[PDB]
Amino acid sequence: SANNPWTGFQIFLSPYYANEVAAAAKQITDPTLSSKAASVANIPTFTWLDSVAKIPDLGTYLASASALGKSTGTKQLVQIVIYDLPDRDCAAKASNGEFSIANNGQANYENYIDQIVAQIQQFPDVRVVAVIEPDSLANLVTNLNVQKCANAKTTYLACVNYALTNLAKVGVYMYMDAGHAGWLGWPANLSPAAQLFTQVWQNAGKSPFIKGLATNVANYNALQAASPDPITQGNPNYDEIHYINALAPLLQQAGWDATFIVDQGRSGVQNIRQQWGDWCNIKGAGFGTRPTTNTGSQFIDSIVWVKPGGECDGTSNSSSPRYDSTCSLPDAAQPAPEAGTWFQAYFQTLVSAANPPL
Numbered sequence: 283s284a285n286n287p288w289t290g291f292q293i294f295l296s297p298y299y300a301n302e303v304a305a306a307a308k309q310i311t312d313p314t315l316s317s318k319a320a321s322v323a324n325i326p327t328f329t330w331l332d333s334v335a336k337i338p339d340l341g342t343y344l345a346s347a348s349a350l351g352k353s354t355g356t357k358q359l360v361q362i363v364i365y366d367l368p369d370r371d372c373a374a375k376a377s378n379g380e381f382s383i384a385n386n387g388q389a390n391y392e393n394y395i396d397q398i399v400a401q402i403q404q405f406p407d408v409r410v411v412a413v414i415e416p417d418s419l420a421n422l423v424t425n426l427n428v429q430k431c432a433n434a435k436t437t438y439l440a441c442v443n444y445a446l447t448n449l450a451k452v453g454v455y456m457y458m459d460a461g462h463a464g465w466l467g468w469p470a471n472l473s474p475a476a477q478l479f480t481q482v483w484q485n486a487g488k489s490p491f492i493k494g495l496a497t498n499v500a501n502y503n504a505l506q507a508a509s510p511d512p513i514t515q516g517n518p519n520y521d522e523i524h525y526i527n528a529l530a531p532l533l534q535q536a537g538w539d540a541t542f543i544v545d546q547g548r549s550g551v552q553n554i555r556q557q558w559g560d561w562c563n564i565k566g567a568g569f570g571t572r573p574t575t576n577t578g579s580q581f582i583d584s585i586v587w588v589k590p591g592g593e594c595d596g597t598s599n600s601s602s603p604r605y606d607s608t609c610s611l612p613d614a615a616q617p618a619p620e621a622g623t624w625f626q627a628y629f630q631t632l633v634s635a636a637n638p639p640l
């Protein structure tokens with residue numbers, strides 16, 4: 283590979299996360315633990331554009347990044363997540379979003395992307411790296427018999443295409459979400475997954491800005507497992523390095539020099555789940571390996587922190603329309619607030635259990 287988006291750039295630290303972390307650390311009673319938690323705001327994370335109201339935030343982040351770059355004599359990089367599909371989260375309930383297909387979803391999303399493009403277009407000196415629509419494509423590999431997913435398949439593909447095609451015109455480096463090793467990493471899923479991703483890549487014109495795929499976003503898999511998690515029984519690809527070593531060659535066969543980024547933001551503590559599919563607020567997770575480009579794998583551009591640890595995965599209140607029974611499992615921290623909202627006790631455990639220690 284030739285073009286790693288991080289080379290020669292300084293990552294712009296998320297002010298949104300920083301404000302959450304500064305607030306959470308002053309509430310942590312242990313003094314050294316509070317110091318460690320406070321330091322989390324200096325670790326680069328991805329900022330989620332999980333609703334239109336966040337688009338002005340992206341405005342202020344690019345402008346701050348531009349200024350930081352001019353004043354420090356560096357080139358700055360802003361890390362974002364495109365996550366506002368119509369009928370979002372089609373195989374769960376916890377992260378249902380603000381747009382729906384039956385309520386002008388297609389148009390709302392295209393306007394969402396347009397407004398994002400118009401922001402990024404005003405700051406050519408700032409590089410952007412985007413993860414494209416967590417969970418969407420993977421749902422279209424394994425969840426087509428889910429009627430919500432099946433009904434939204436063509437909307438998902440159209441919208442993902444619209445994001446890819448139009449963010450490319452303002453030079454955004456993009457990694458399409460590709461699930462994780464327990465999802466698409468199953469050997470029998472590798473080829474169907476690859477066929478989808480290469481179709482999506484081809485449909486977006488094979489633009490050089492489509493770098494490749496992101497894995498483990500908002501999940502907890504090891505990148506390189508010391509020993510296989512017991513939940514991984516039956517899958518030889520028990521960790522993300524196995525998944526990626528098995529999937530990436532298929533992408534290259536079709537001529538896509540595809541590279542990867544891997545969430546490790548909540549991967550510090552392994553063996554914390556009853557079943558692999560337990561994804562919601564897993565009790566006892568720690569912050570994992572810090573973001574770095576020294577990945578040890580020919581396919582991986584960066585270890586990253588995509589899901590901001592401490593922001594909730596979903597509510598445990600079964601009276602909310604966004605209740606998902608996954609968020610009430612014995613390995614899920616409860617009680618838990620609405621997804622995307624701050625979960626103070628979960629953040630403290632992420633700090634305490636961080637591996638490597640903070």
Ligand SMILES: OC[C@H]1O[C@@H](O[C@H]2[C@H](O)[C@@H](O)[C@@H](O)O[C@@H]2CO)[C@H](O)[C@@H](O)[C@@H]1O
Nearest residue numbers: 371373374417464465500501558559561
């Ligand atoms: O990993 C985060 C997403 O997981 C999704 O559920 C997956 C799960 O990850 C797999 O381990 C397996 O259970 O397949 C599931 C899909 O049916 C979930 O739908 C999303 O809400 C999560 O963000």
